[PDB]
Design a binder for this molecule. Structure first.
Ligand SMILES: Nc1ncnc2c1ncn2[C@@H]1O[C@H](COP(=O)(O)OP(=O)(O)NP(=O)(O)O)[C@@H](O)[C@H]1O
Ligand SMILES: Nc1ncnc2c1ncn2[C@@H]1O[C@H](COP(=O)(O)OP(=O)(O)NP(=O)(O)O)[C@@H](O)[C@H]1O
Lengths: 285, 285
């Protein structure tokens, strides 16, 4: 209801695929349902929820489909593939969230918004690509649908958006047009959440704590931790540029900007980390 | 713009494709641009708008790729293809819409919602496919996201949804799951329009008017017609079940339920029909 604080939640790969699980519909559905049970608890606890996710495996599969049917069907550019993946992913999360609602005798009240994320065309990353092949991962500037998203949470709708970090776009002399690229879903969710001026940013992943000296002897799992300690641990290089790196960067940005707690944890214990009982919680300088 | 009347607008195939055009992204993009101009005028005129469309060619192209690559990537079902066509199409309309707002120096305020539509899973169509090769077309019973759509127009947001008629679904024992149909985009929009209790239902196509004796020596283009008169015209069988039939069905039902007017016109004379100056306009007795 209306009284509730807002928490912005970024699901990871494990909301749809477990390690070595294959990309079929029913397998992914089962994962989302499970994933939706954890989320419902957060909404039941009285929190206002905005859901986000990644789309890597899903958009890759679509792009896999568009390339291998090229002779029988026109081949869509990456950014459009991104788009079909939002309908796909959105659909699933929409459906599952409604089903967990009804299961609890609460009338369904959530939706999925196609989302476009503007990026700077003059981004360095256009000129030094990454993961497949070869493709930019530019910083998110703006969530184009931000305004409607705020309207929806101001009305206590459970909003699902930015799945995959948003459809990458640019605006040049008043024209938005899609670009061929990908955006880190976590940076994108930091972006939304600070604009929303949210009360929390949660990044949900498969590990229950960020660590330093990760997979190593003197390993240490981060718990509740101050902004300055994590800023220092980051330049120390503890976080991997392809996994944990963006997340911490995501959490650090949002906490720096709003003073509000950001959280990294297992999808399986989301509510506990909110209640203070575990997970890496970055708090305020 | 909290003062404007509401018009539910159902776009047709030509929002994205002209006679014998190729299902590629740029060919459909620029078609959508053209529709977006027409729509903007309506919005500029002061009306609240809900935007709908069909998806046949697009879901078809998607359903096509999923089989052409069923040996590289896993093959998705019909309703998930639907959810993919929705992301993609909604993407195009979203971006085009936003671009035309910017071109008029007006701040963007538009959204595409992923949409589900409940149907009875033992509808007669699951016993005799019969929609254009002939396929099913079950009767739409519920737009799941109705509540959020309602909310979104109450806030004067320009809402795009039920693209392609909505992802076909059904709800057994508190569980919504996807069926493998396609819904008539016009019936579905009639449902929404009358649930929203809109001031207008408008179905935009590639002909200026519904006719009787179509393409036949004594062809009468219908203009402004009371509901009783068009009921009796329909029963006689002037409206081919492939094309105009369900459009008139949709108009009739909407007007029978609300007493407000429905419309069938060409996409580019939409504002004129609203100004009473043309097009088939069905009204109450
Ligand atoms: N310093 C670290 N602490 C904890 N885990 C780490 C660290 N560095 C790398 N990792 C790994 O990062 C993994 C989680 O990130 P990741 O593989 O990207 O999953 P995800 O982000 O939830 N999915 P997705 O959003 O689809 O990319 C963990 O399983 C760890 O294996
Ligand atoms: N009695 C009739 N009067 C006028 N047009 C008719 C009639 N009967 C059939 N038609 C045709 O129906 C066509 C419109 O419907 P249709 O061909 O299905 O396109 P659409 O419904 O606008 N697209 P979509 O949203 O993808 O289903 C017109 O172009 C007419 O050629």
């Amino acid at each position: 209801m209306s009284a509730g604080k807002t928490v912005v939640i970024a699901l990871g790969g494990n909301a749809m695929l477990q390690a070595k699980e294959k990309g079929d519909y029913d397998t992914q559905r089962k994962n989302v349902e499970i994933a939706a049970s954890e989320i419902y608890k957060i909404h039941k606890a009285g929190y206002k929820v905005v859901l986000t996710s990644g789309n890597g495996p899903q958009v890759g599969a679509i792009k896999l489909q568009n390339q291998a049917a090229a002779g029988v069907s026109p081949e869509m550019p990456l950014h459009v593939c991104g788009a079909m993946s939002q309908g796909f992913i959105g659909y699933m999360m929409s459906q599952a969230m409604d089903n967990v609602f009804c299961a609890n005798n609460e009338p369904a009240n959530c939706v999925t918004c196609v989302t476009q994320t503007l990026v700077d065309p003059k981004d360095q990353a256009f000129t030094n690509p990454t993961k497949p092949v070869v493709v930019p991962s530019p910083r998110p500037l703006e969530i184009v649908e931000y305004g409607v998203i705020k309207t929806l949470i101001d009305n206590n709708v459970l909003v699902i958006c930015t799945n995959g970090g948003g459809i990458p776009c640019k605006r040049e002399n008043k024209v938005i047009s899609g670009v061929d690229a990908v955006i880190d879903k976590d940076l994108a969710t930091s972006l939304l959440a600070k604009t929303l001026n949210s009360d929390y940013l949660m990044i949900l992943t498969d590990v229950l704590n960020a660590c330093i000296n990760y997979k190593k002897p003197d390993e240490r799992k981060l718990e509740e931790i101050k902004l300055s300690e994590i800023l220092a641990l980051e330049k120390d290089g503890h976080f991997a540029a392809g996994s944990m790196g963006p997340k911490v960067r995501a959490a650090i940005e949002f906490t720096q900007a709003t003073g509000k707690m950001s959280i990294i944890t297992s999808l399986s214990t989301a509510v506990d980390a909110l209640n203070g009982k575990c997970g890496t919680r970055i708090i305020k300088d």
